[PDB]
Enzyme design. Structure first.
Site, mmCIF file in Angstrom:
data_model
loop_
_atom_site.group_PDB
_atom_site.id
_atom_site.type_symbol
_atom_site.label_atom_id
_atom_site.label_comp_id
_atom_site.label_asym_id
_atom_site.label_seq_id
_atom_site.Cartn_x
_atom_site.Cartn_y
_atom_site.Cartn_z
ATOM 1 N N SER A 14 0.844 -1.182 0.000
ATOM 2 C CA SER A 14 0.000 0.000 0.000
ATOM 3 C C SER A 14 0.882 1.235 0.000
ATOM 4 O O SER A 14 2.005 1.217 0.509
ATOM 5 C CB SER A 14 -0.968 0.042 1.197
ATOM 6 O OG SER A 14 -0.362 0.593 2.360
ATOM 7 N N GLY A 15 0.355 2.307 -0.584
ATOM 8 C CA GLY A 15 1.068 3.574 -0.615
ATOM 9 C C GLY A 15 0.289 4.593 -1.414
ATOM 10 O O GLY A 15 -0.946 4.546 -1.468
ATOM 11 N N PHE A 17 -0.202 4.708 -4.370
ATOM 12 C CA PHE A 17 -0.984 4.015 -5.387
ATOM 13 C C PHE A 17 -2.289 3.426 -4.851
ATOM 14 O O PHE A 17 -3.126 3.009 -5.655
ATOM 15 C CB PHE A 17 -0.142 2.895 -6.014
ATOM 16 C CG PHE A 17 0.524 1.993 -4.999
ATOM 17 C CD1 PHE A 17 -0.077 0.804 -4.601
ATOM 18 C CD2 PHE A 17 1.752 2.337 -4.442
ATOM 19 C CE1 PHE A 17 0.537 -0.027 -3.661
ATOM 20 C CE2 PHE A 17 2.372 1.508 -3.501
ATOM 21 C CZ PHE A 17 1.765 0.326 -3.114
ATOM 22 N N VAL A 20 -3.220 -2.764 -2.400
ATOM 23 C CA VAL A 20 -3.233 -3.832 -3.397
ATOM 24 C C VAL A 20 -3.249 -5.166 -2.668
ATOM 25 O O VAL A 20 -2.354 -5.444 -1.857
ATOM 26 C CB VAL A 20 -2.015 -3.741 -4.334
ATOM 27 C CG1 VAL A 20 -1.952 -4.949 -5.272
ATOM 28 C CG2 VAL A 20 -2.028 -2.421 -5.105
ATOM 29 N N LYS A 35 -6.822 -3.873 -6.442
ATOM 30 C CA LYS A 35 -6.282 -2.573 -6.066
ATOM 31 C C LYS A 35 -7.411 -1.612 -5.718
ATOM 32 O O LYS A 35 -8.312 -1.380 -6.535
ATOM 33 C CB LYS A 35 -5.423 -2.010 -7.195
ATOM 34 C CG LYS A 35 -4.910 -0.622 -6.931
ATOM 35 C CD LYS A 35 -3.802 -0.281 -7.912
ATOM 36 C CE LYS A 35 -3.708 1.204 -8.164
ATOM 37 N NZ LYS A 35 -2.416 1.571 -8.826
ATOM 38 N N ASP A 135 6.097 7.287 -14.729
ATOM 39 C CA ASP A 135 6.701 6.817 -13.483
ATOM 40 C C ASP A 135 7.461 5.522 -13.739
ATOM 41 O O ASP A 135 7.359 4.551 -12.987
ATOM 42 C CB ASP A 135 5.647 6.661 -12.383
ATOM 43 C CG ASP A 135 6.267 6.663 -10.962
ATOM 44 O OD1 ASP A 135 5.569 6.272 -10.005
ATOM 45 O OD2 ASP A 135 7.456 7.036 -10.811
HETATM 46 C C1 LIG Z 1 1.905 -3.579 -4.133
HETATM 47 N N1 LIG Z 1 2.882 -4.016 -5.124
HETATM 48 C C2 LIG Z 1 2.540 -5.229 -5.882
HETATM 49 C C3 LIG Z 1 1.664 -5.037 -7.101
HETATM 50 C C4 LIG Z 1 1.183 -3.804 -7.467
HETATM 51 C C5 LIG Z 1 0.335 -3.643 -8.552
HETATM 52 C C6 LIG Z 1 -0.042 -4.718 -9.304
HETATM 53 C C7 LIG Z 1 0.432 -6.014 -8.984
HETATM 54 C C8 LIG Z 1 0.108 -7.170 -9.734
HETATM 55 N N2 LIG Z 1 0.557 -8.387 -9.456
HETATM 56 C C9 LIG Z 1 1.364 -8.521 -8.391
HETATM 57 C C10 LIG Z 1 1.756 -7.488 -7.590
HETATM 58 C C11 LIG Z 1 1.294 -6.179 -7.870
HETATM 59 C C12 LIG Z 1 4.101 -3.478 -5.306
HETATM 60 O O1 LIG Z 1 4.818 -3.797 -6.235
HETATM 61 C C13 LIG Z 1 4.589 -2.431 -4.338
HETATM 62 C C14 LIG Z 1 4.852 -2.811 -3.019
HETATM 63 C C15 LIG Z 1 5.390 -1.901 -2.125
HETATM 64 C C16 LIG Z 1 5.669 -0.617 -2.530
HETATM 65 C C17 LIG Z 1 5.409 -0.225 -3.831
HETATM 66 C C18 LIG Z 1 4.868 -1.121 -4.749
HETATM 67 C C19 LIG Z 1 4.597 -0.699 -6.183
HETATM 68 C C20 LIG Z 1 3.124 -0.338 -6.486
HETATM 69 C C21 LIG Z 1 3.186 0.914 -7.395
HETATM 70 N N3 LIG Z 1 4.419 1.620 -7.005
HETATM 71 C C22 LIG Z 1 5.374 0.621 -6.502
#
Ligand SMILES: CN(Cc1cccc2cnccc12)C(=O)c1ccccc1[C@H]1CCNC1
Lengths: 273, 9
Positions: A14-15, A17, A20, A35, A135
Site C-alpha cells: 500500500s502507498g 498508489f 493492493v 487494487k 513513473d
Molecule cells: C503492491 N505491489 C505489488 C503489485 C502492485 C500492482 C499490481 C500487482 C500485480 N501483481 C502482483 C503485484 C502487484 C508493489 O509492487 C509495491 C509494493 C510496495 C511498494 C510499492 C509497490 C509498487 C506499487 C506501485 N508503485 C510501486
C-alpha cells in the site's frame, strides 16, 4: 458484485498508489491483484468512451490492456461509494525489479540488456496506445520469474501522450529529468528516455545514480561499478542534460549495446530459474 | 550505501 467474483487474500502493498491485495478469480482460479483507491485521493479524472467518470488510471489501463504485452492488464474494475477497485493480472511467481536488484546487486549486462529491451518494448507499446506512463522505475516493473517476462505496473501518475509541454508531474522525482527540476516543464518522450537512462544505470550499477536535485541537473554520471564502454555510452546519451540530445526509442534499440538480446525464456533459464 | 525506494509525488 466484487465480493462474489474474487476470493481476497493478503495485502501485497500500500502507498500513494492505494492498497493492493492478492486475489483469485473464483471463475477459473486466475491469480489477480485487487487494487483499491479512495475517490478523495484521486487527482486526475477522465471519461471512458461511454462517458462514465473514472480515474485517469482506468482510462490509461484500458488503452494499453488490449492484447498481450509487457504491461499489466486491467481485467475489470468496479465503482464503490468512496472508492474504485481495479482487478489486475497477477504473475506468479513474481518479484518486483527493485527487490530483485537489492537482492542480486548489479545485474550482469546480458541480463540488464534483456530486461531493458523488454522495458523498451513495453514503453513503445504504451506510446503507440496514446499513453505516457510518467513513473518508469524498477519499483514499477514486475518480473515473471518462470517466463522471464517483465510487466510494467502503476499508471496512476500517467497521462495521455501529447506533443505539447507538460507542466504537471507526480511521478518519482529521482527519475524525473533536469528540465522538470529547473523549469517544471518537460516533453513526454524525452522525459521518458531520461527515466530509462536512470533505470539502466540502476540495473548495471545496483542503484540509481542521483538522489538530489543538484545531481540530477549537474550532468555528471559517475559509474560505481564496472560497466562496458558501450553501455556507459548509451546511459550517458539517455541522460543528456538537453532533452533534444537524448536518443529516440529507435536509436536506443539500434544502439550497439542493445544487439543480440536474449529471448524471455532464455533469460529465465539462464538467470532466473 | 543506503539503497531505498522513492514514493511517487
Ligand atoms: C503492491 N505491489 C505489488 C503489485 C502492485 C500492482 C499490481 C500487482 C500485480 N501483481 C502482483 C503485484 C502487484 C508493489 O509492487 C509495491 C509494493 C510496495 C511498494 C510499492 C509497490 C509498487 C506499487 C506501485 N508503485 C510501486
Amino acid at each position: 458484485p466484487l465480493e462474489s467474483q474474487y476470493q481476497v487474500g493478503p495485502l501485497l502493498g500500500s502507498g500513494g498508489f492505494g492498497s493492493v491485495y492478492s486475489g483469485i478469480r473464483v471463475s477459473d482460479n486466475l491469480p489477480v491483484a485487487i487494487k483499491h483507491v479512495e475517490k478523495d485521493r484521486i487527482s486526475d479524472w477522465g471519461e471512458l468512451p461511454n462517458g462514465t467518470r473514472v480515474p485517469m488510471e482506468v482510462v490509461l489501463l484500458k488503452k494499453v490492456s488490449s492484447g498481450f504485452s509487457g504491461v499489466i492488464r486491467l481485467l475489470d474494475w468496479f465503482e464503490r461509494p468512496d472508492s474504485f477497485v481495479l482487478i489486475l493480472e497477477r504473475p506468479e511467481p513474481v518479484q518486483d525489479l527493485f527487490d530483485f536488484i537489492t537482492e542480486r546487486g548489479a545485474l550482469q549486462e546480458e541480463l540488464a540488456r534483456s530486461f531493458f529491451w523488454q522495458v523498451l518494448e513495453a514503453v513503445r507499446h504504451c506510446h503507440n496506445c496514446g499513453v505516457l506512463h510518467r513513473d518508469i522505475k524498477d519499483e514499477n516493473i514486475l518480473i515473471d520469474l518462470n517466463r522471464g517476462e517483465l510487466k510494467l505496473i502503476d499508471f496512476g501518475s500517467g497521462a495521455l501522450l501529447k506533443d505539447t509541454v507538460y507542466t504537471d508531474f507526480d511521478g518519482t522525482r529521482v527519475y524525473s529529468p533536469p528540465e522538470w527540476i529547473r523549469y517544471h516543464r518537460y516533453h513526454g518522450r524525452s522525459a521518458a528516455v531520461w527515466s530509462l537512462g536512470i533505470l539502466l544505470y540502476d540495473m548495471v550499477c545496483g542503484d540509481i545514480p542521483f538522489e538530489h536535485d543538484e545531481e540530477i541537473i549537474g550532468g555528471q554520471v559517475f559509474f560505481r561499478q564496472r560497466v562496458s564502454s558501450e553501455c556507459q555510452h548509451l546511459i550517458r546519451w539517455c541522460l543528456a542534460l538537453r532533452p533534444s540530445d537524448r536518443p529516440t526509442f529507435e536509436e536506443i534499440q539500434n544502439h550497439p549495446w542493445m544487439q543480440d538480446v536474449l529471448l524471455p525464456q532464455e533469460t529465465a533459464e539462464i538467470h532466473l530459474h | 550505501r543506503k539503497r531505498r525506494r522513492h514514493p511517487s509525488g
